[PDB]
Known about the structure:
The structure is cut from a larger assembly and holds chains A, B, C and D.
Chain A: E1 2-6, E2 17-24, E3 32-38, E4 44-49, E5 67-68, E6 71-72, E7 77-82, E8 91-93, E9 96-98, E10 109-110, E11 114-116, E12 128-130, E13 136-141, E14 157-160, E15 168-172, E16 189-190, E17 193-199, E18 210-212, E19 226-228
Chain B: H1 3-28, E1 30-36, E2 52-58, E3 61-67, E4 87-93, H2 100-111, E5 120-126, H3 129-135, H4 155-172, E6 183-184, H5 194-213
Parallel strand pairs in B: 1-3, 1-4, 4-5, 5-6
Antiparallel strand pairs in B: 2-3
Helix pairs in contact in B: 2-4
Chain D: H1 3-6, H2 14-23, H3 31-34, E1 48-52, E2 59-64, E3 70-75, E4 79-84, E5 89-95, E6 101-106, E7 112-117, E8 122-126, E9 135-140, E10 147-152, E11 158-162, E12 166-170, E13 177-182, E14 192-193, E15 199-203, E16 209-213, E17 219-223, E18 230-235, E19 241-246, E20 250-255, E21 260-263, E22 274-279, E23 285-290, E24 295-299, E25 304-307, E26 316-318, E27 331-332, E28 337-340
Antiparallel strand pairs in D: 1-28, 2-3, 3-4, 4-5, 6-7, 7-8, 8-9, 10-11, 11-12, 12-13, 14-15, 15-16, 16-17, 18-19, 19-20, 20-21, 22-23, 23-24, 24-25, 26-27
Amino acid sequence: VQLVESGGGLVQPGGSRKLSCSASGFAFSSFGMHWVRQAPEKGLEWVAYISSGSGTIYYADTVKGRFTISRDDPKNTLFLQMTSLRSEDTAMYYCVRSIYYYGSSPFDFWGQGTTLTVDIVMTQATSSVPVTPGESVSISCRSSKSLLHSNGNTYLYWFLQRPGQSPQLLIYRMSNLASGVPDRFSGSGSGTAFTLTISRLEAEDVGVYYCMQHLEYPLTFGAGTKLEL
Amino acid sequence: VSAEDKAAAERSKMIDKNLREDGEKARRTLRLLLLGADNSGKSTIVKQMRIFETKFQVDKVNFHMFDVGGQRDERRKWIQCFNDVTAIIFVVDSSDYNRLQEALNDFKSIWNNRWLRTISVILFLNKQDLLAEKVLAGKSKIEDYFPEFARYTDPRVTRAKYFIRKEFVDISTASGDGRHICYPHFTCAVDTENARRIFNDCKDIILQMNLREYNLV
Amino acid sequence: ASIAQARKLVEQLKMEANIDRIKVSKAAADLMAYCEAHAKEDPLLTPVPASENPF
Amino acid sequence: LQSELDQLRQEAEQLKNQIRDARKACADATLSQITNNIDPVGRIQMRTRRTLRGHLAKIYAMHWGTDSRLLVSASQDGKLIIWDSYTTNKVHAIPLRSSWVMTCAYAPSGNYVACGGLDNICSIYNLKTREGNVRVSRELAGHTGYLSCCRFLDDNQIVTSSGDTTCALWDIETGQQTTTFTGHTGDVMSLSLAPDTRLFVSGACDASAKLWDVREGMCRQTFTGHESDINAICFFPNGNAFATGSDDATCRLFDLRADQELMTYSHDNIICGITSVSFSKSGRLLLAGYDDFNCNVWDALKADRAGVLAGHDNRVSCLGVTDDGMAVATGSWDSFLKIWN
């Protein structure tokens, strides 16, 4: 599995840019691809979405109409058309793979993001915690609506972003765990407030985590809970 | 309904679309079962081969003929898997009258089958090349192993060759009428209208089954 | 070829006969005990409430 | 066949009149003498709650997932489908190399699914992979007869029963042969692993079933109480009994410790044979899929029919209760799966 996209650079405002992703190493036609932006020092903001095949397109409100999403299945290619480079357009865009069937783990893989310079509110009140290594951490995030759906699963996702690394999946859909993720990771919480209680944290854990919802398709991001010393 | 549930439903819809796409291809072709004896030479019955299956098309219609192998001499449980084929090709060679009794008993067993009551058989009498040279000399006749192989209608070769057909049609029309009918043919090693005879039999089989399915017979 | 009988007269036959067997009563009124003790947790004998039932 | 066959043929029978005598000695009751005063389960009714359509050819096997939600259906169209019973969604559609498949099983962890048919090979598929698709994990060849029942012991070992009179256990990682259970004199049709997963039973076409020791390797006992082929078998939830579904229009059950036949479960008006059997959650209800497009529900203690499961226009070939006993997943030759209550 290897996802990559290219087409970054500098844009004079009012111009168009063809941003394309070169998927490789997996069944591309059976994966609903996404796109997630991130300003240089602000935080992730999901921008668009394409389903398996050519189904629903789910642009975000801030870029609706201005950006277009296209894919080319037989060559294993994904795109993101951009028009009218804006002031907030300066961000690093990521392509994240997800599949939706019973028991699947969406947002499992991300590609190394390219930088192109120029409404369920979820808040992580702590944007910086100096956590002593070896003991524990209790990263928390809260929402405005109850993520507990009728089918019985809350749709909160956790991610990890080490310096110089694409985001990686973490405890997803409340207390579920992804592949390649150590068993020390755990997280539970009710609707409107969640936690990320980790057991015996070690090195290579310092990074800015994120809390995203998946109930209503506008997928707001938390502020982030980057650690330190 | 959740967004993830919606995407799962769309994935399921694509799954049914792809599954239904293959249904047209599956229904277009015709399925045949090949069976007989070890000495029958069933493989060379279809000289144009193009579970040992073969895929031959004559008159631009495809047939998939399955030759079951490796299984024991029971056919009691794996024959309850082919009750959807167009016909069963029972190939028996008449080179020896010592085994024709066993062959006709096998045909009786497979024709009077509960799961094969509504499926027809096309009888291929393989190896008709040496029947002449076995009856032209007459050094060992069928009347040695049978009571009344002493009347039937080279003339001698044909009168000898039609008695086995009389016995087999007697077996076929002993029990079971209308639903399934045997198709006695005569096949050789160098004969070329073997697949043609198979096609000419299965078109009539389909015609009969459509007659029954439109209630005209 | 004394293998058809050997596996059928000293391997399987001589071993099947030498097995501790209990009277049928203690098995009949053990299946009975199991099914009586699991009547409340059997959602086909006693249908669950509609809300509880996921179908 | 020497003087040890005018001797060791009787001595192959001396242990048969001294076993039936031992067998018929420990019988001071029948099942309907201590299960007589228990009130009947009543006219058990069960409507269909979800009809899983989508298959084209006839269905031959159906296995429930351990999570009581997913199930895998095997049909003669060469396609394997993993379902979501709650929403009737199709999780996967795995094409098959051999269009003739008569077996299907779900791994207890849910990470694997096995299938096998006239190809005499059990192909084991990996469900959850980083690749994103379903591909074969192993190609378990080395068996001559057609496969008739596959059951997953663990995530790495599987037990298969074929038509060459041999039940036989593999190891998925190596793909080689660990133990071969021999002694049947006919095509083995069914298999039912015990809840403790240290024993299993299998019914062949010799009117006899054998309880095998999967750890050790030899048949503990043989159960002869039928007169035709045994094409169905299932294990009691308590692990001390099991039921045989035979094609002689009757379905008997046996007790492992008693080593006898307890009841017959036969009706005079029923002539068609049985295809599949299963106990629901406590062994009181014995679901049995028959050949006349029906599936009777038997009060096991009382040997009386509690209900019928009509709704299939072709013969029922698959029958399985879920782990929590909340539903049934009967599937028939009409290419339609059905979920009852």
